[PDB]
Each structure stands twice: as structure tokens, then as C-alpha cells.
Write a protein that holds these residues in place. Structure first.
Motif, short mmCIF file in Angstrom:
data_model
loop_
_atom_site.label_atom_id
_atom_site.label_comp_id
_atom_site.label_asym_id
_atom_site.label_seq_id
_atom_site.Cartn_x
_atom_site.Cartn_y
_atom_site.Cartn_z
N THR A 92 61.63 -6.25 5.97
CA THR A 92 62.10 -7.48 5.44
C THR A 92 63.33 -7.18 4.65
O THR A 92 63.33 -6.40 3.68
N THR A 93 64.44 -7.88 4.93
CA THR A 93 65.67 -7.61 4.23
C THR A 93 65.82 -8.50 2.98
O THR A 93 65.02 -9.41 2.74
N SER A 94 66.87 -8.21 2.24
CA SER A 94 67.18 -9.01 1.03
C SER A 94 67.39 -10.49 1.36
O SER A 94 67.28 -11.36 0.50
N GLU A 95 67.76 -10.78 2.60
CA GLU A 95 67.91 -12.16 3.10
C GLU A 95 66.67 -12.80 3.59
O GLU A 95 66.68 -13.96 4.04
N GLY A 96 65.55 -12.07 3.59
CA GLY A 96 64.35 -12.54 4.13
C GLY A 96 64.27 -12.42 5.67
O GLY A 96 63.28 -12.86 6.26
N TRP B 196 64.27 1.36 4.43
CA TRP B 196 64.22 0.80 3.07
C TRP B 196 65.30 -0.26 2.92
O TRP B 196 66.46 0.12 2.85
N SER B 197 64.89 -1.50 2.78
CA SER B 197 65.85 -2.57 2.54
C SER B 197 66.48 -2.47 1.19
O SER B 197 65.85 -2.05 0.17
N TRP B 198 67.78 -2.80 1.14
CA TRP B 198 68.56 -2.65 -0.08
C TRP B 198 69.58 -3.82 -0.25
O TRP B 198 69.41 -4.85 0.36
N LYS B 199 70.59 -3.61 -1.06
CA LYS B 199 71.46 -4.68 -1.49
C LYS B 199 72.17 -5.33 -0.32
O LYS B 199 72.55 -4.61 0.63
N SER C 91 71.57 -4.66 3.50
CA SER C 91 71.63 -3.32 3.93
C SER C 91 70.18 -2.78 4.16
O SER C 91 69.24 -3.28 3.54
N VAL C 92 70.08 -1.76 4.98
CA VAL C 92 68.83 -1.02 5.24
C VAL C 92 69.17 0.43 5.28
O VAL C 92 70.03 0.86 6.08
N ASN D 232 71.08 7.26 7.41
CA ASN D 232 72.12 6.30 7.84
C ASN D 232 71.91 4.99 7.17
O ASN D 232 70.77 4.48 7.08
N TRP D 233 73.02 4.38 6.75
CA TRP D 233 72.99 3.01 6.36
C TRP D 233 73.20 2.07 7.52
O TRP D 233 74.00 2.39 8.38
N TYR D 234 72.46 0.96 7.55
CA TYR D 234 72.62 -0.13 8.47
C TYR D 234 72.88 -1.39 7.68
O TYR D 234 72.36 -1.58 6.55
N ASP D 235 73.76 -2.25 8.22
CA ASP D 235 74.04 -3.55 7.66
C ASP D 235 73.56 -4.51 8.68
O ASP D 235 73.87 -4.39 9.88
#
Length: 482
Positions: free
Chosen positions: A124-128, A181-184, A187-188, A198-201
Motif C-alpha cells: 500500500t503506497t502513501s497514496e493508498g 517498503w512504501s515511503w514518501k 515511492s517504494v 532500488n527505489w521505485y516511484d
């Protein structure tokens, strides 16, 4: 500081996947289209059972999902506490259980994924939104990233979120069980198991960028990870192997510290734990400690061999591991563990490998940690009680006043309600909360973090800990989006 096990609990299906039900705190478990075995194609349905934490009743196995065999899936809880399960034996399917419709009510369908998959990770991301990537147990095509928008019931492929950067060097399903891990700001972080993070957007058409190596760690398939202090950006990682099977797992232990998305993640090596583990589970507790349970040394599937029967309690403040009371049943591949609202920890499962298969473990137990006992480690402590919350649904930044039954000096934390299978639990994270005393030592006001990358939307357990460190039984609340 060994805690205590409760009595053995026996389910009518092997509890290979488990979820904590919001508000009731009951434990929902499921296997597949059978109680005791699985196939890649599945049986077009899933058997489930429910443990009632108030009565101790274990329900009979029901066919709670009539369209999707939810063995080997992704799991996430959305902003409203719905459990969204993706793929697995029914590789293209998305199903939802909304506890508000009843805990034993039918799972219902959502839109099929763009890329069918199994053993993926979902978060689940910061955006839901619900992001998935990888997963080659089942399905077809390069298992690239996609994102589910629950408001539009749509899945969209993200061209900028290819799976390639996270694939491990060796072994089976090398794109699977990512440590997401979802983040700001949508981002994941993929923290592992590959040693290349790796970062994913997840916004727009997506993007990805290297987050650095995980120190000098090796690839660590079915190692475990948990965000134990989301406000500080802190993730603990442990164990795993250089392939899905065939290697000795490690006892390697790291703390990752997240700064901004796209920027290098800082990695600190800790002293190794005493027991090398593959296929273990790790659970964050309200005080910020982490329990690591089960796993084996030489990794093989559907096997009770080289079991690690002594769990470890890890303290991230000190970087130190201590053993807790051993179990007798191996908890290796297909074992589960999960924090309960009473602050005990479910541990059970393992197997799912045929009728009369000796590796099938239908059972588990709840472990009571040291913080539920007095200083002798054996007498159950008197626990504090949350008498009221001022609100049960709040936005990021919003205040919550917590009224305690008894005056005291309290600390607080919010732990996100979660679900797990196959060592993967992206839903769990802990946020410590400082409370302002209302003047009587009973009412304390906290604020939810303002950043949705920290306070991912959805249901949380609010814990209050007295001055000695003993937690209350949690109250549920949700963090809502604008």
C-alpha cells in the motif's frame, strides 16, 4: 526475558497466509483450494478459517472465496482496512475482503492484474494505491511493476518500474518476495532480497533508481525485514539465502535508514544473530522490539530439516539479540507470524504438502513477550487500559486524545494492521508517538505523522505502555486520505 507460549491452537487448514482483522482483532487464516495441499493452477477457490481472540473459537473451514485460489499471492491492506489479495494459484485475479461486510462474508472480485503473477510482493503506497512487482510462481510475462487505484478499480503498468533491477543473481523465483517498503510521495523502496536495493516511484508512468547495496550483504531470499520506526525511516533486515533453496541461510542483521526517495540508503551492520534463518518471520512489537521466529539453516521447501526452534528478540536501540522460549514444531517454509491487538504474537503453520504429509502443521501458538510479565518474567503483569479515543478515523497530522483508565506516565505507538505469507509482510510498520499529558496523567494527546509516506493510510493498533513498559490491549483506528 523469554516470554511464554500459550496453548496450541489448531486450525482445520494449514495457516500459510494470515491476516489480522481490523476492529475485532480476530485472526483470519487461509491455505488454498484445499486444506492440506496446493497446485500451481489451484482449485479455483480458497478455504479459510477464523480464530476468535475473545472466545478462543476456531471456525470450521469454509470456502470463503469461490473464484480465486489465493495460495501464493500478494497481500495488502488498503486505506479502509480491506484485505486485497492478488494472484497466486489464480494468477491474474484480485480479490477483496471488506471486514465491514462481515469477517466470514464472501471475498469479492476486483479488476484482474495487467500481468498475472504469484509470489509477488504487494504494498500500500502513501497514496493508498496497491503496488505489485515480481512474482514467478505462477503467471506469464516479465513480472514488471503495476499499480492498483482502488478508487478507479484499475491496474496500470508502470513502464518506469521494471523488475530487472531487483532480480537476484541465482536460484528459483529470483524476482519474487521483494522487501517492499512504501515511503514518501508514492515511492517504494525495494530493500532486498537482492543485495542491490532500488527505489521505485509509483506515480505517473513510474521510475526507478538505485538505492545502493545493502552493505556487504549477499542476496538474501526469504530473509525478513520490518519498518520498526517509520518516523526515523528505520528498517531491520535479517537472514535469508543466496538462492531460494540449496544454500545455508545467514544470520546477517542490518539496520537501513531511509532519507529522501531516490537518495542512497544508509546501512549499518549489526552483530549477527545466534541462529541463521531462511523462511523465518519477523514481527515488530509496540515497544519497538522485533521478534524473529522459525526458519531453517539449509534451505529446502516443504521440509522440517535443520529447523531453528529458538526465536530471538531483537532490540534495535542496542542492536542486540536474546533467545526466547523454544517451540517444538519446526516453522520453516509456509510458516507465519503476526502481531495481535493483545500484544502477543501468533506463530504457526508450515508445510501444505499433501494428505497425511508429516510436514503439514495445522497448529500454532501465541507467544506472550516479556513486556506482559512482571520483573520475574513469569507473573502476568497488570496492564494499562485505553478508556477512550477522541476519534477513530483521522487524517495525517491530526490529533488523537487517548484517555487511560489509570493515571500514569505513558508512552505510545501506532502499529499498522497487517497480513503475511511466505515471509512477506509489507503492511506492518511501527510509528512511535509522544503524548502530551492533559494534566491528570490520564488523558494524553498525540498527533499522527503528517507525511503519508510515514503514516501509510489504513488501520493501526494504538498501544499505550506504562512506565514499566507494559502495553495495553490496543485500540483500532484508521489514518484516512484527503
Amino acid at each position: 526475558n523469554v516470554g511464554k507460549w500459550g496453548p496450541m491452537v489448531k486450525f482445520p487448514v494449514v495457516p500459510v497466509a494470515v491476516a489480522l482483522v481490523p476492529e475485532t482483532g480476530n485472526l483470519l487464516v487461509w491455505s488454498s483450494g484445499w486444506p492440506n495441499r496446493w497446485t500451481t493452477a489451484g482449485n479455483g477457490k480458497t478455504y479459510t478459517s477464523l480464530y476468535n481472540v475473545n472466545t478462543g473459537n476456531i471456525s470450521d473451514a469454509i470456502v470463503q472465496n469461490t473464484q480465486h485460489d489465493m495460495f501464493c499471492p500478494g497481500t495488502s491492506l488498503d486505506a479502509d482496512g480491506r484485505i486485497i489479495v492478488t494472484g497466486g494459484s489464480s494468477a491474474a485475479k484480485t480479490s477483496v475482503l471488506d471486514f465491514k461486510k462481515g469477517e466470514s462474508s464472501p471475498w469479492t472480485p476486483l479488476s484482474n492484474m495487467q500481468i498475472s503473477r504469484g509470489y509477488q510482493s504487494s504494498c500500500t503506497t502513501s497514496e493508498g494505491k496497491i503496488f505489485v512487482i515480481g512474482g514467478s510462481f505462477s503467471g506469464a510475462g516479465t513480472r514488471n511493476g503495476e499499480v492498483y487505484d482502488p478508487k478507479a478499480n484499475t491496474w496500470t503498468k508502470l513502464a518506469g518500474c521494471p523488475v530487472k533491477p531487483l532480480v537476484m543473481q541465482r536460484g528459483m523465483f529470483p524476482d519474487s518476495h521483494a522487501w517492499l517498503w512504501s515511503w514518501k510521495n508514492g515511492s517504494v523502496l525495494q530493500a532486498g532480497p537482492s543485495k542491490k536495493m532500488n527505489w521505485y516511484d509509483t506515480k505517473g508512468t513510474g521510475s526507478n533508481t538505485p538505492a545502493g547495496l545493502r552493505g556487504t550483504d549477499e542476496d538474501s531470499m526469504c530473509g525478513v525485514s520490518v519498518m520498526y520506526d517509520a518516523v526515523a525511516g528505520k528498517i531491520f533486515t535479517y537472514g535469508g539465502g543466496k538462492g531460494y533453496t540449496g544454500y545455508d541461510s545467514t544470520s546477517n542483521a542490518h539496520i537501513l535508514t531511509l532519507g529522501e526517495p531516490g537518495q542512497a540508503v544508509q546501512v549499518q551492520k549489526l552483530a549477527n544473530g545466534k541462529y541463521n534463518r531462511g523462511f523465518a518471520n519477523a514481527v515488530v512489537m509496540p515497544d519497538g522490539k522485533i521478534w524473529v521466529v522459525g526458519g531453517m539453516q539449509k534451505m529446502w521447501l516443504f521440509s522440517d530439516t535443520t529447523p531453528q526452534l529458538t526465536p530471538e528478540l531483537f532490540d534495535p536501540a542496542t542492536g542486540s539479540f536474546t533467545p526466547t522460549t523454544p517451540h517444538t514444531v519446526p516453522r520453516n517454509y509456509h510458516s507465519t507470524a503476526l502481531l495481535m491487538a493483545d500484544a502477543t504474537i501468533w506463530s504457526g503453520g508450515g508445510g501444505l504438502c499433501g494428505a497425511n504429509c508429516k510436514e503439514n502443521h495445522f497448529d500454532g501458538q501465541f507467544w506472550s513477550p516479556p513486556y506482559l510479565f512482571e520483573a520475574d518474567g513469569v507473573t502476568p503483569a497488570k496492564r494499562p487500559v485505553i478508556q477512550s479515543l477522541s476519534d477513530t478515523a483521522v487524517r495525517a497530522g491530526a490529533p488523537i486524545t487517548i484517555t487511560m483508565q489509570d493515571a500514569g506516565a505513558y508512552t505510545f505507538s501506532m502499529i499498522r494492521v497487517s497480513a503475511t505469507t511466505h515471509t512477506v509482510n509489507t503492511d506492518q510498520r511501527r510509528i512511535p508517538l509522544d503524548g502530551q499529558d492533559g494534566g491528570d496523567g490520564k488523558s494524553f494527546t498525540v498527533n499522527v505523522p503528517n507525511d503519508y509516506g510515514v503514516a501509510i493510510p489504513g488501520y493501526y493498533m494504538l498501544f499505550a505502555m506504562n512506565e514499566a513498559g507494559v502495553p495495553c490491549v490496543a485500540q483500532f483506528f484508521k489514518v484516512t486520505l484527503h
